[PDB]
UniProtKB/Swiss-Prot annotation, chains A, B:
It comes from Mus musculus. The sequences of cardiac and skeletal muscles are identical. It comes from the Eukaryota. GO terms for biological process: cardiac muscle contraction; in utero embryonic development; positive regulation of heart rate by epinephrine; ventricular cardiac muscle tissue morphogenesis. The modification Phosphoserine is found at S3, S15, S35. GO terms for cellular component: actin cytoskeleton; cytoplasm; muscle thin filament tropomyosin; myofibril. The keyword Transmembrane helix does not apply. One of its GO terms (molecular function) is protein heterodimerization activity. The chain holds residues 172 to 228 of 284 of the full protein. The molecule is in a coiled coil structure that is formed by 2 polypeptide chains. The sequence exhibits a prominent seven-residues periodicity. This is Tropomyosin alpha-1 chain.
Amino acid sequence: IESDLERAEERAELSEGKCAELEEELKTVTNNLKSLEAQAEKYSQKEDKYEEEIKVL
Amino acid sequence: IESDLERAEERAELSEGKCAELEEELKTVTNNLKSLEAQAEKYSQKEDKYEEEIKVL
């Protein structure tokens, strides 16, 4: 029982480390996604203006 | 020692569950990033095409 308990606690520590790393990755990717969403909105505005000018011409 | 083993097991289980959830979240957000990047590339190409159309018309 003692050996099994030691192994289980080591497993738990490893899982906690993995969870911390995953949190870091998630936050980084979230920031990148927000930046690209803003970029796409700028793209949309540019397209709107170009379409209007095309219609006028 | 048996009670200690039970506590270690439950802590490991909780940590693994959180790890799985974080994995799913990172997968989803990374897929979103990939899709948005493809859209942005297509949008740059479309913008160049629209400017060419403006000039010719």
